[PDB]
């Protein structure tokens, strides 16, 4: 079915590096240079107050829509990723359900400015105070902290491409039917990532990457805060949350 479902040679690992970086370049959603350039476009105290005065449900709906848009690009990345479309549909869905949010969380560090602790949201850079109406400050600050720790790594676009491919191709996801096939694909992607770090003298980042448990906790907290919102505004979720968002985080 796929070359990366068996033992890959060095030349084939080199080809995988190029492929993953290209699939990422084609589905990265926002270009890094556009995100970097807009860092000086910061929300005013008046604009921040405007977001803070928005209702909880309207802020939740806007964030769910923006998160859904980012997830759509991750689905495309997955689709272009070597071996992914050769896995069975159950496995494809398992991997995306568990991993899409995690890939989005990793990708978000590109949109985060560690210098002033702001993130790119709806055209400008705003701090965590921008999301006060949500009423989940512990989850917001934990996402900000995560983006802060990844930003400290000075990730290149190629590093993000290879690392997110690994976040997604995780043979430990509960419910995988063709586990060994995923295990082999993950191993080749690990080799691709580590080869690139070896080749660019960036192996020092290996011990600095977040523990796998960290992305899992962030995703679990999101699912939990969504259930609390769902109890308060059930018709909002049912009527105005994107269907893709509900399929992934509220069982349909």
């Amino acid at each position: 079915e796929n070359l990366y479902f068996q033992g890959a040679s060095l030349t084939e690992i080199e080809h995988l590096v190029q492929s993953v970086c290209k699939s990422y370049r084609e589905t990265c959603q926002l270009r890094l240079e556009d995100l970097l350039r807009q860092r000086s476009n910061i929300f005013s105290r008046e604009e921040v107050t405007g977001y803070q005065r928005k209702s909880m449900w309207e802020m939740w709906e806007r964030c769910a829509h923006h998160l859904t848009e980012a997830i759509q690009y991750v689905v495309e990345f997955a689709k272009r990723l070597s071996g992914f479309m050769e896995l069975c549909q159950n496995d494809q869905i398992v991997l995306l359900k568990a991993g899409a949010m995690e890939v989005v969380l990793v990708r978000m560090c590109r949109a985060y400015n560690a210098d002033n602790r702001t993130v790119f949201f709806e055209g400008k850079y705003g701090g965590m105070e921008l999301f006060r109406a949500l009423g989940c400050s512990e989850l917001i600050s934990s996402i900000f902290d995560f983006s802060h720790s990844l930003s400290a790594l000075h990730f290149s676009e190629d590093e993000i491409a290879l690392y997110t491919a690994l976040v997604l191709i995780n043979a430990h996801r509960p419910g995988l039917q063709e586990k060994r096939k995923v295990e082999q694909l993950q191993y080749n992607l690990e080799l691709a990532f580590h080869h690139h770090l070896c080749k660019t003298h960036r192996q020092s980042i290996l011990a600095k990457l977040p523990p796998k448990g960290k992305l899992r906790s962030l995703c679990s907290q999101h699912v939990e805060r969504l259930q609390i919102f769902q109890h308060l505004h059930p018709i909002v979720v049912q009527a105005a949350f994107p269907p893709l968002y509900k399929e992934l985080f509220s069982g349909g």
């Binding site: 549909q89 995306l96 893709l244 399929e247």
Partner: peptide
């Protein structure tokens, strides 16, 4: 009972 993922995966 939404099923957007299979649609997205199937669309080419």
């Amino acid at each position: 009972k939404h099923k957007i993922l299979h649609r997205l995966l199937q669309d080419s």
